[PDB]
Amino acid sequence: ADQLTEEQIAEFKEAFSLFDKDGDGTITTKELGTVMRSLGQNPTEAELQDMINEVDADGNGTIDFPEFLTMMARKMKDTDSEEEIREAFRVFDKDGNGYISAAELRHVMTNLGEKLTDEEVDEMIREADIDGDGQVNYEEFVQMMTA
């Protein structure tokens, strides 16, 4: 609640392992690159070096656990994602009218990205179509999921 809980530190150590592939105790630009790309991002070599340099204490060119904590301490604060999620839905609002039909939602979700099964799409629509009119007012639906 106040910048720290021995429980967080524990989890953050588990996090370090998500980065330190060889668990050699340090994160290199090569390991950081692999993780960033596993998240669908594509940092250049200089950008990887800059991420490390930003919190490179002993300037050895790599990040160790202690340094992996100043980077977090500096940005513990979170903020709601409502507007960004609404914008993601708007990508599929063909006519820019604020609605996406139940049919268009199935067409998007069963074909794009990682996808949902038709049965998962039925469950999502059951919750999103509040009026039962086969249309999803997405600004309202996102407000409800993020409320």
């Binding site: 998240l39 669908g40 960004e84 993601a88 794009l112 990205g113 990682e114 949902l116 919750e127 999921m145």
Partner: protein, 81 residues
């Protein structure tokens, strides 16, 4: 660019996918499976950050084109575009 558009459609579909799955697993279930929530939160941040990456590349592309336009306009003060 078709590649950038493609990045947007896939990433946006995934933001819908993971927002739904996080909501379902943290509000429409009797027993919250944190392991599942973590998995979907990882996929959620990945899709949100991919859309941010496309938006920043589009702002970069736009300023590169505005640089060409500004240079062309010199052939015509401190105003730009």
């Amino acid at each position: 660019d078709t590649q950038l558009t493609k990045r947007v459609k896939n990433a946006a579909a995934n933001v819908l996918r993971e927002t739904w799955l996080i909501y379902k697993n943290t509000k429409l279930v009797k027993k919250i499976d944190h392991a599942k929530v973590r998995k979907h939160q990882r996929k959620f941040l990945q899709a949100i950050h991919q859309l941010r990456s496309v938006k920043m590349e589009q702002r970069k592309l736009n300023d590169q084109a505005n640089t060409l336009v500004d240079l062309a306009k010199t052939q015509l003060h401190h105003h730009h575009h």
